[model samples]
Every structure is written in structure tokens, then in C-alpha cells.
Target: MKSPEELKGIFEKYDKEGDGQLSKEELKLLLQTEFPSLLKGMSTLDELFEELDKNGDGEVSFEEFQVLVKKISQ
Candidate 1:
């Protein structure tokens, strides 16, 4: 588990395009590079996306992403 501050740093790191939302490709690339084992047994990338996309926007903004991370880590 990660602390909220740690997750915030991570969110800032992975949000490369600075577009607030992370596309599927961006999220996949980040996970593959930084959190390789975290995606296991989720079935597919889409499942991860669904989990992160808190607002149901089909993408993950930093706030939504942070909320998910903080929730899970806690």
C-alpha cells in the first residue's frame, strides 16, 4: 500500500501529457514500466481503466486517479 502523498507524487509522474486524463496507452505504459506486477489477474487493460476511471469518463483524470489509488492503498 502507498500513502496519499506517495500516490500524489506517482500521479504527477505518470501524467505525462499534462492533459489531466490518462489515456489507455499512457496508463498501460506507466503500469508496465513502473508497476509491472500490479495489473495481474485484472483480466485486461480495460478492467484497470474501469477501475481508475472514477467519473466514468472513459479515461482517468489526476483527481480520479488519485482517489482510486488512495482508496486502494488505505
Candidate 2:
């Protein structure tokens, strides 16, 4: 339901810092704003972090975020 451009913008929108990574807090915010209903379905923010493990440090990067949402969003 969103464009790649929007996806890029959204990730940054919730990233909190310009370093290009997402903390658990923003992951929550990300869903609250973007995924709406899905937010309550999977408030398991920490679980999402496992799926977002693309960060390799119990976290998610912008790339990880895109992949995670795209799959689950489907």
C-alpha cells in the first residue's frame, strides 16, 4: 500500500537517528503509524526484532525493516 519512496521515508521517519538503524521503541512507533491494525496483532516488538535480525545485534536496520514489513504486510 506504500511506495518504495514512502517506505524509505517512513523508515527514517521512525529511525530516531540518522545512523540508519531502528531501536525497539521506533519499531513500535513504526507499526503504530504505518501498520495500524497489524500493530496490535503483533505488538511483539521484541519478536519482530528477531525477524529484524538483519541488524545482527538484536536489532533492525532500515533494510531489515523493509523486508520485515513487506513479508508480514502481505
Candidate 3:
């Protein structure tokens, strides 16, 4: 299991406006900075944003991002 603090730190790092959510651009930056390997011919940023933005809000909440973390860790 991932530590909550570690997850929060990462979320906060890219949540540039302190809005507790990540815009597509912010998510892209986070993935680029922290998980470049995941982007390796897998999906484009647009595809990722569509998958992660579960609510169709154009931003990803921590809960949505957690789903991704779980996938990557497994």
C-alpha cells in the first residue's frame, strides 16, 4: 500500500493552484516529472486526461488519481 502522505505530497506538488484537483496540464506535468516510463508509447495526454477525469469535469480529483496509482503499483 502506498503511504497517504506520499500520495498527498505528489498531489499537492502538481496542484499548482492549491485547488485540490489536477487540471489536464497539471496531470501531464506530474506524470512527466514522476512517471515518465508510464508515458512510453502507452497513451497521449489527451487519452490519459479522458480516462482520469471520471466525472467529466475537466479536472482529476485525488480519488480519480488514486485509481491510477493503484493500477501502476500493481
Best by lDDT: 3
Per-prediction CA RMSD (Å): 2.6, 2.4, 2.1
Q: Judging by lDDT, tell me the better candidate of 1 and 3.
A: 3
Worst 10 residues of 2 by lDDT: 50-59
Which is better, 1 or 3, measured by TM-score? Answer: 3
Per-residue lDDT for 17-66 in model 3, tens only?
Answer: 77788888788777776877776567578767676665668888787887
- Model 2 segments beyond 4 Å from truth? none
lDDT for each of the candidates?
Answer: 0.65, 0.67, 0.73
**Compared with the true structure, what per-residue lDDT tens digits does model 1 show for residues 1-74?**
33437766666677788777788766766566556556654525876677657355767866767665655433
Model 2 CA RMSD to the hidden true structure, in angstroms: 2.4
Model 3 bad stretches (over 4 Å): 1-5
* Distance from true location, Cα of 25 in model 1, Å: 1.7
Error at 52, model 1, angstroms: 3.5
lDDT of 3: 0.73
* Predicted structure 3, TM vs. truth: 0.78
**Tens digit of per-residue lDDT, candidate 2, span 26-53:** 7777777667776667656666666556
Best to worst by TM-score, what's the order? Answer: 3, 2, 1
What does the lDDT come to for candidate 2? 0.67
